[PDB]
Structures are given as structure tokens and as C-alpha cells.
Ligand SMILES: Cc1cc2nc(NC(C)C)c(N3CCN(Cc4ccc(F)cc4F)CC3)nc2cn1
């Protein structure tokens with residue numbers, strides 16, 4: 001398709017309908033499903049709305065780039081594409097802090113600070129994304145004799161470059177947070193083993209002592225280890241330790257040890273529970289990793305070409321950089337369905353009349 005410019009367009013022309021359609025479906029499910037009202041999925045919905053504007057913007061671009069009322073309207077549509085890109089990258093960052101903050105300390109991840117911040121994230125996102133998309137309609141265009149146009153007219157090279165430079169820095173920070181997220185998950189997975197080691201060491205030393213105090217020390221060091229596992233990623237175990245502790249103090253070494261050995265019944269069920277949650281956390285973080293990789297891999301080529309390209313360069317270099325960026329909004333709805341089970345359930349929920 002090197003010499004085929006319009007066939008490059010027709011590929012994107014109908015692809016905008018797909019991107020507009022599929023995202024329009026996702027935004028509905030988040031809005032129409034209470035289980036998806038959690039901050040994670042609300043922020044994902046914003047990305048869908050951002051990816052939604054991408055499909056609408058280019059659809060109206062072709063509809064107006066070919067037999068439109070006027071070109072000034074086409075200068076609004078480019079704002080939609082600008083607005084979508086800012087609304088997509090901005091919200092994509094927002095999902096990262098939600099993951100980091102949620103994993104960093106869920107107890108501090110309360111329904112007050114979080115839900116408050118969530119509305120500001122979307123508000124601070126779209127108020128800026130739209131604002132950037134509206135700047136061209138206030139003079140930030142390239143249709144002047146003293147302004148050089150970019151690969152995507154009427155956007156000027158000066159302004160697309162600032163967006164490109166801003167995008168690199170924003171994407172550079174999102175990578176840093178993802179590592180911090182990993183550090184959080186690693187740390188949450190590290191202190192857990194220490195509690196398990198101390199918890200098991202305490203159980204064993206309980207048997208290897210004939211003093212009623214050695215039992216108290218191990219249980220006290222055991223209760224603290226049990227408690228530390230709760231503050232990390234927020235009953236019967238500690239409750240049974242309390243019952244075990246209640247016996248140790250009042251001279252019940254023989255029977256207090258018996259209660260310590262029933263903890264294994266709960267502890268075996270207690271340990272088997274935490275492992276699954278980290279599996280859910282890793283996949284949730286893993287899905288975050290995949291999304292970030294696709295976003296950059298599909299937008300970065302355009303981010304560079306719009307700054308280092310020349311108007312003496314062929315057009316195929318333009319679409320070759322827009323094609324991944326355009327279809328990036330088509331792929332984002334697909335990723336969550338195949339990875340995130342909570343939203344995938346609603347997708348296959350509708351099965352028959
Ligand atoms: C036929 C056609 C389709 C276009 N489809 C655009 N969008 C799609 C890829 C969602 C698009 N936009 C314009 C706004 N732009 C913002 C931007 C993004 C990154 C960057 F480094 C610098 C920037 F200025 C994104 C691409 N222009 C187009 C021009 N003609």
C-alpha cells in the first residue's frame with residue numbers, strides 16, 4: 001500500500017467505526033454494571049471513552065475531509081484526535097496510580113480518599129484532554145504563513161512536538177510506577193514468607209519447651225506475625241490464637257499446645273487463601289504491563305515521525321505510523337476481555353434470548 005493513499009484511508013475509515021463501536025460497548029458495561037463501578041474499572045472506562053473519541057474523530061474526519069461543510073470543521077475533528085490521545089494517555093497513567101495505591105496499602109486505600117481522587121483523575125483528565133483538543137480552534141494551528149505544518153494538518157510541528165515530548169516524559173514515568181508496583185507486590189510477597197517462617201518456627205518451639213512462658217512468647221510472636229499479614233493486603237486464625245493464648249496464661253500448657261496444633265487446620269486453609277490473591281494481583285499487574293507495552297509500541301512511532309519527518313517524505317511513512325496508533329484503540333478493548341475475568345463475565349453473560 002505504498003502508493004495507495006486512499007486505500008490507506010479506507011482501511012482507517014471503517015476501522016474508526018469498529019473502534020467507536022467496540023468502545024461504545026465497553027463504556028456501557030462499566031456504566032450499567034455495579035460490579036464494574038470499582039475505581040479500577042471506572043478508570044478503564046475513561047480510557048474506552050478516550051479510545052471511543054478516537055473512532056469518532058477519524059470517522060468525522062473522513063466524512064468531512066471528503067465533502068464537508070468547511071475545513072474549519074476539520075480543524076475541530078483534529079482536536080478530537082488530539083483530545084482522544086491526551087485522554088487515553090492521561091487515563092492510562094491514572095490506572096497505574098490506582099494499581100500502585102491499591103497495592104501499596106489497601107487499608108489506606110479507603111473508599112473516601114480513593115473515590116474522591118478517582119473523580120478528580122477523570123475530571124483532571126478530560127478537562128485537560130479536551131482543552132488540548134480545543135487549543136487548535138483558538139489559534140494553535142499551522143495554517144499561517146509563519147508556521148510550518150506537521151504530518152497531521154492543521155497541527156503545527158511546534159505543537160505536535162510538545163505533545164510528543166510531553167508523551168515521552170509521561171510514558172517514562174508510567175514505567176517507573178509499574179516498577180514501584182512490582183516492588184510493592186514483591187514486598188507484599190516477601191514479608192509474607194517471613195511471617196510464615198516465624199509462624200512455623202513459633203509452632204515448633206512451642207512443642208520444644210516445658211515452661212508455660214515459652215508457649216506465651218511463641219504465641220505472642222505468632223499473633224504479631226498473623227497480624228502483620230492483615231495490614232499488608234486487607235480472623236479465625238488470630239481468634240483461635242486468642243483462644244490458644246487465653247489458655248497459655250492460666251496454666252494450661254498441655255491443653256494450650258493442643259489448641260496451637262488445631263491452628264494448622266485453619267492455617268492450612270489460611271495459607272491456601274493468600275496465594276490465590278497474589279495470583280489475581282500478578283495477573284492484574286501483568287495485564288497492566290501488556291497494555292502499557294502495546295500503547296507505546298503503537299503510539300511511539302508516530303510520536304517520533306511527527307518530529308523527525310520531512311514534508312519531502314512519502315505518505316506511506318505517515319499511515320505506517322498512524323496505522324498502529326489507530327488500531328491501538330481497537331486492540332485495547334480486546335486485551336481486558338481475554339485477561340480480566342471480572343469484565344469478561346459480563347461479555348459472555350448475554351447468551352440467549
Ligand atoms: C487521516 C488522518 C487520521 C488521523 N488520525 C489521528 N489519530 C488516530 C491515530 C487516533 C490523528 N491524530 C492527530 C492528533 N495527534 C496528537 C499527537 C499524538 C502524539 C504525538 F506525539 C503528537 C501529537 F500531536 C494524534 C494523531 N491524525 C490523523 C490525521 N489524518
Ligand code: NA
Pocket residue numbers: 051088089295328329332
Ligand atoms: Na489508546
